[PDB]
Design a binder for these strands. Structure first.
Ligand SMILES: [Mn+2]
Ligand SMILES: [Mn+2]
Length: 257
DNA sequence: GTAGCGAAGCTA
């Protein structure tokens, strides 16, 4: 049995109490975090060490930042993407935990299809695909998860017409998501729930979470051996309902052997 | 238009 959760916390300093409650109540075996918004030396290591968790992270000031938090020691820690060696943005960290290769991603948002950040998103996803492909040659059990900033299909967008060829939802971005699936990865939530709206992000503005209008952009992609053991996938909207919340909801997958 | 950072604007 193994339980893994991914959560885009949007500032770990603000959300640390809620991270700690996730780790105390029905804890996962592994928790991965995105958008830490704290530098490498500002990570709350001692507070999570006190509770019995190992932590590896890659941080920077103000933006981005990723961490992996586990009961087991995370081994063979890799930082960033080999095909993009000079990118200073801290968006990828990988480790092997209990025989499972975990690749935690805070994928580029892109801002808008005509933004320069959209070309960056394109290049970055190209580099991610090459890295994942190489990692998959060595690890039969592999999980690629985090904030992809891509809603894969119309059922992952509350208003397909208004988001037509817009950021997160464009046919170009969806092809990049498909490029990752084509390596042999399964969209774990859609294996357990082929139908229905399972949004993971709701805009802070316009009370979108109360309206329950959001996108499914946080995913857990699994290798075949992990899909064969997949038991359930759930979006934790209760964490999203808390006071001063992250705009993303945690997503957890459970496997059995 | 909100949220977080960091101190005005950028990013999401
Ligand atoms: Mn459409
Ligand atoms: Mn944000």
């Amino acid at each position: 049995a193994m339980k893994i959760t991914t959560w885009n916390v949007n500032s770990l300093n603000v959300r640390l109490p809620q991270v700690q409650n996730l780790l105390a109540d029905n804890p996962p075996d592994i928790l991965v975090l995105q958008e830490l918004k704290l530098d490498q030396d500002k990570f709350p290591a001692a507070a999570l060490q006190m509770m019995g968790w190992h932590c590896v992270w890659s941080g920077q000031k103000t933006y981005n930042g990723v961490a992996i938090v586990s009961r087991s020691v995370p081994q063979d820690v890799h930082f960033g993407l080999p095909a993009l060696p000079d990118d200073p943005q801290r968006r990828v960290i990988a480790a092997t935990v209990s025989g499972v290769r975990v690749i935690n991603v805070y994928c580029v948002n892109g801002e808008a299809l005509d933004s320069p950040k959209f070309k960056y998103k394109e290049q970055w996803f190209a580099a991610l695909t090459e890295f994942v492909r190489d990692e998959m040659t060595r690890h039969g059990k592999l999980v690629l998860l985090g904030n992809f900033n891509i809603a894969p299909a119309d059922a992952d967008c509350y208003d397909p017409e208004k988001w037509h060829e817009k950021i997160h939802c464009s046919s170009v971005e969806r092809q990049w998501f498909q490029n990752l699936l084509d390596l042999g990865l399964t969209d774990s939530l859609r294996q357990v729930h082929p139908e229905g709206a399972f949004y993971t992000w709701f805009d802070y503005r316009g009370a979108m979470f109360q309206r329950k209008l959001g996108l499914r952009i946080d995913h857990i992609l699994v290798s075949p051996a992990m899909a064969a053991a997949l038991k359930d996938v759930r979006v934790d909207l209760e964490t999203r309902a808390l006071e001063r919340p992250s705009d993303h909801a945690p997503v957890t997958a459970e496997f059995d052997w």
